[PDB]
Design a protein around this ligand. Structure first.
Ligand SMILES: CCCCCCCCCO[C@@H]1O[C@H](CO)[C@@H](O)[C@H](O)[C@H]1O
Ligand SMILES: Cc1ncc(Cc2csc(CCO)c2C)c(N)n1
Length: 177
C-alpha cells in the first residue's frame, strides 16, 4: 500500500469529522448525515478496505473528541465503529476504468447508506426506545427515525455525488502518474 493511499484515507476521515460538526438535525434524532460523503467518495475511489478503515478512523475521531453520543460500550461500538466502517461496502462498486458511469455510484451510495442506517435502526431499538414518541413501539419508532434519516442522507449524498460525477469524474477513478 502507498503513502499516497494512507494520505487519502486520513484526509477524508479528517474531512468527515470536520463535516459531522455542522448542525444536521431536521427533527429530534432525524438528521441529514452529509458527513458520510467523504467516506463514500473514499470507498468508491479506492475500494472496500480503504473505505472500511477510513470509516473506522472517523468513528474513533468522533468518540475521542467528544462529538459522539454514547450510552454504553456496546452501543458506542455498534454506532461509532461498525456503523461508520460499514460505509466501506460502497467500495465494492468502484470503477477502475473510464468512462465513469453514474449507476454504480448511486447503487453503491444507496446500499451503504442503507447498511449504516440499518445498524442505527437496530441500535435505535435496543438503546434508544426510552425516547419513542407517545403511542409508538420501539421498532416503529426506530424505523421512522432511522428510515427517514437514511433516506435524507442518501438524497444529500446523491445530490453531491451527482454534481461530482458530472463536473469532476476522475475523482472516482484512482490513477497513478
Ligand atoms: C421528513 C422529516 C421529518 C420531520 C417531521 C417534523 C416536521 C418538521 C417541522 O415542521 C412541521 O411541519 C408541520 C407540517 O407542515 C407543520 O404543521 C408544523 O408547524 C411544523 O413545525
Ligand atoms: C431512535 C434512535 N435514536 C438515536 C439513534 C442514534 C443515532 C442515529 S444516527 C447516529 C450517528 C450520526 O451522528 C446515531 C448515534 C438511533 N440509532 N436510533
Amino acid at each position: 500500500f502507498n503513502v499516497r493511499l494512507l494520505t487519502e484515507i486520513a484526509f477524508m476521515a479528517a474531512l468527515a469529522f470536520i463535516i459531522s460538526l455542522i448542525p444536521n438535525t431536521v427533527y429530534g434524532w432525524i438528521i441529514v448525515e452529509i458527513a458520510c460523503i467523504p467516506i463514500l467518495l473514499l470507498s468508491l475511489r479506492r475500494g472496500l478496505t480503504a473505505g472500511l478503515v477510513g470509516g473506522l478512523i472517523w468513528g474513533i475521531l468522533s468518540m475521542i473528541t467528544g462529538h459522539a453520543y454514547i450510552l454504553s460500550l456496546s452501543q458506542a461500538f455498534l454506532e461509532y465503529l461498525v456503523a461508520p466502517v460499514s460505509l466501506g461496502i460502497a467500495g465494492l462498486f468502484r470503477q477502475k476504468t473510464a468512462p465513469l458511469k453514474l449507476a454504480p455510484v448511486l447503487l453503491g451510495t444507496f446500499v451503504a447508506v442503507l447498511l449504516k442506517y440499518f445498524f442505527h435502526f437496530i441500535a435505535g431499538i435496543i438503546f434508544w426506545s426510552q425516547y419513542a414518541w407517545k403511542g409508538w413501539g420501539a421498532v416503529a419508532y426506530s424505523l421512522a427515525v432511522n428510515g427517514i434519516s437514511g433516506i435524507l442522507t442518501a438524497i444529500a449524498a446523491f445530490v453531491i455525488l451527482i454534481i461530482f460525477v458530472k463536473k469532476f469524474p476522475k475523482l472516482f477513478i484512482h490513477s497513478n502518474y
